[PDB]
Amino acid sequence: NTLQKIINKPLSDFLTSQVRQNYHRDSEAAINKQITLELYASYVYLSMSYYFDRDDVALKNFAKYFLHQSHEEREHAEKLMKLQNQRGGRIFLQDIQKPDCDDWESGLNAMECALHLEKEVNQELLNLHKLATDKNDPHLCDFIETHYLNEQVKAIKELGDHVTNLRKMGAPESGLAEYLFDKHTLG
Amino acid sequence: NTLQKIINKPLSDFLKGGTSQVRQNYHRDSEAAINKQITLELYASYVYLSMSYYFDRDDVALKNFAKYFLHQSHEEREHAEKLMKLQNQRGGRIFLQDIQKPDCDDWESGLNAMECALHLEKEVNQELLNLHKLATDKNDPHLCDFIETHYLNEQVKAIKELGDHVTNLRKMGAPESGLAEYLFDKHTLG
Amino acid sequence: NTLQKIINKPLSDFLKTSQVRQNYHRDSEAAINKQITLELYASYVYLSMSYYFDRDDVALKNFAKYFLHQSHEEREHAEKLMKLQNQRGGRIFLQDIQKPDCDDWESGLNAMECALHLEKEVNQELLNLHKLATDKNDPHLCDFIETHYLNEQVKAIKELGDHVTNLRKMGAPESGLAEYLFDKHTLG
Amino acid sequence: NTLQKIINKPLSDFLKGGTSQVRQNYHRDSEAAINKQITLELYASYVYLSMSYYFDRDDVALKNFAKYFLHQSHEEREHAEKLMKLQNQRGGRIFLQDIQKPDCDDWESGLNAMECALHLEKEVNQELLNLHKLATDKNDPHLCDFIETHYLNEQVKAIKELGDHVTNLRKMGAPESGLAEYLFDKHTLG
Amino acid sequence: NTLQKIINKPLSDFLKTSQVRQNYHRDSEAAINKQITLELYASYVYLSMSYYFDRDDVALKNFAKYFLHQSHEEREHAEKLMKLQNQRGGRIFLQDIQKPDCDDWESGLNAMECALHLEKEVNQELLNLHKLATDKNDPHLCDFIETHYLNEQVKAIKELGDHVTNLRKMGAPESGLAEYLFDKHTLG
Amino acid sequence: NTLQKIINKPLSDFLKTSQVRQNYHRDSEAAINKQITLELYASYVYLSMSYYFDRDDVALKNFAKYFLHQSHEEREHAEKLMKLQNQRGGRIFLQDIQKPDCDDWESGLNAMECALHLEKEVNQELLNLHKLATDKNDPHLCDFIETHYLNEQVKAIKELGDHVTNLRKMGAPESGLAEYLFDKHTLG
């Protein structure tokens, strides 16, 4: 899992200003690591979106839904870069690795992969909050809380709801199920 | 059922002790039965509240089933508040009691929840009819007309709608077809 | 005190795996179920308080309106905790809602004083809930309590203290004129 | 600096003596530190007020520098009023003290004033972070969240903006170029 | 009395050539700096007064609003004197703003009485400032004090005297009902 | 130049029949996937430029806005190319987006010059892509390039050249006043 590979790199791989105060180098590095995760997640959703744009898949609202998710992730990354400059840290950009799948199989499978991805990103934001708590950085703790933590919980709950419905309607075997879910839930 | 335990409790247990300047032709039994009816409406409110957030679960995820029962829970609380208003209007004294928890935490499906709601509404309707019989026997025409205009047709309408909902879900294959409950959630409750 | 009895009940009485569950301890899950019954109980107290002032021998309509509003706010508090429980993957476990401690709230001052004490007892449980979430390293739960309960609780306590003060300075418990004018000028 | 004398004064000197019906989980140290923070915000208000009318002088005459610092002076007074509101909300007692005069009557230029404002905001931010550490140690989550939502990001935003202002003025030749301060006054602060 | 101490400070403590300066004596310049600290001090007293009535054990919201407004008016008075100082070519010389004399203002009546006395003490200094400007043959300074301070001071004194009278006739210091009704009907 | 390494990569590395595919050569499908990578890379470069000027030691807000908008336009270009790939029956093959060459652009002039070079390099690959479509007799792909990229590329290059000229005339990278005034008057 290339996502798990990014999560396992040390903080030193993601590395004085007049504005800097109470901003630990570990926090600065973790913010740069979080930028990479958000940019990667944006790439995964962009890939998912145009998979459903294929003539042999052709689920238009699945495509719209994941495209909007991709733009939300890109917006998260840009707000993290803004925070980095606000605190006096320096942005250190890395390669955005390609997603692990070219073919996402089905609408149910794509929602299951999105649920897994959001829970893995949530764990990193939780570890990022723990690091900011250990470094006594309450401004960074507040930033993570206000902008991410409840947004991840809602995204995870919404993806779980979508997974549950698709499985109860007929799993990926019923192409009728994915079509009707595309119209009635994502429409 | 916890409902039956409330229904079969002696009337005098719904009185504060076990005269208002406004009290007139308001029998102690009627005052007691109004307090009993408040407990039933509050209980029914709790049942629909439990039902509502069952469908809000990530492993059930029927948003309109959840919205529908939450609205019903609020209507029941409103019926109870109006009965408390009536109790004070006639000079009775409100005597509250524990609101017992519902019998289930896990309703099985949209069909089963509709069916349990149908049974609950008929049980509450029966107690409302007994309350009317008591008001007739005590020659309380104001109480009789109060029950008629505010509860009797509303219970009949609720009972008819729940039956329609049960019927439609059964015809689409509700217990087994998750597609049936999904499309009913969209087309009828949405 | 029924409320003290609920507060002293152990966490295990508020219990008995989800695809959305993450970093959600069983203790936090039980404590959310505990807080749900506290808010439901508080809603019941205010409901009782409200219709006491609707009595023909009390007849303070704005006291009644004030407490009925607080009753609906506590119910909304409870419903948002049930929504949170499902958001995090816990299982809602409902208990009996005990009847309020009083049937007769005596006066407007006395009802305000009981409301102040009730809101302070609920605040303590919220602070204990926040402490448990901090120990369990649940920042989302910590933030949820912070944004939705702590400042609202502090504002509720300050408003009730203000009300109790004005009523006492007006001569409330003896002076029925004081409670009438307070009902008109502050709650009206 | 007069600021450092306030910061290093013992906590108990910011208490009235040296229980409210609403007081709950509000430690004496927190009550003292809120009174200390009020003195700092009032001091910062005085500093920006002195800065503002320096640029209003006929021999300085930078109208937008004057408007900018006067607005900052009003924001600081507003922070102090809100802390007095919080003190009463939690049952503490407001204890005021002398607002010491600023250290300068003659700020040297627009750049120097921006730089002194940058230093003052970082000094106040540091005391706000110490106040948060104290509220954490006393397990006061309401106070922690109050400081977070109302001061911490606002201080970071103020600190970033002042740094931008200092940077731009230095790049245009601010200390020596009066043209630089004139055009910055027009294009950035106007 | 901190205010008496400021008033008794000599003019030389409020000092230490401009192209705009004309007919502006160093005495007038020092007296403007003195008046600035008086208005700043008065703003501090009213601020203290305001949040005394915001206390949960006082809880008179319109008293608090009234005094907070007066605090901002005194601050605006001070800022206009700083603008005048620069208009005439003087140099602003800021001093410490002393803390108010009281922490506890006792009651609404007592706060109004202290406000009346404060406004009368500031009025005296304004009249002394106008007298100095007349002796120095500074008609612009005389006119500035006339249009911006004298009638506003007289109106402030008359309004506070009215307030003190109504509170006393209502039974203010003993009767908490009086101060509550005055807060609602006159300040509300 | 990381850009050149992408440009010099063979077409076979950009490849991993549909009912809609018609007259769509495998080389064109691969070259579309290559152009997607180029537009995504350019988006990354402009995003890096944008937040360079957002730094507190650079602090040119309109430079930052100008490049952020350019970064969104490049990403919009990439999304329309993926739409084209699916329209013609090709299969999107995504690759790593390489990090930009510089973390630290030196100034507004240097960033503008680097943008000028980048757009010219992307224009050359679009012209090669048009040449490939011409040789494979793909008039639909030729027209797609003509209408959506060629004139937009020419307009971007002329604008960037205009900006570079003005910045150099005004005082080059040495005048910080020049970059500030250009930021206000041209990019504002």
XYZ file of C-alpha atoms in Angstrom, chain D residues 104 123 137 158:
4
model
C 8.136 55.509 23.785
C 4.883 38.983 23.790
C -2.851 22.050 34.175
C -2.067 39.494 13.604
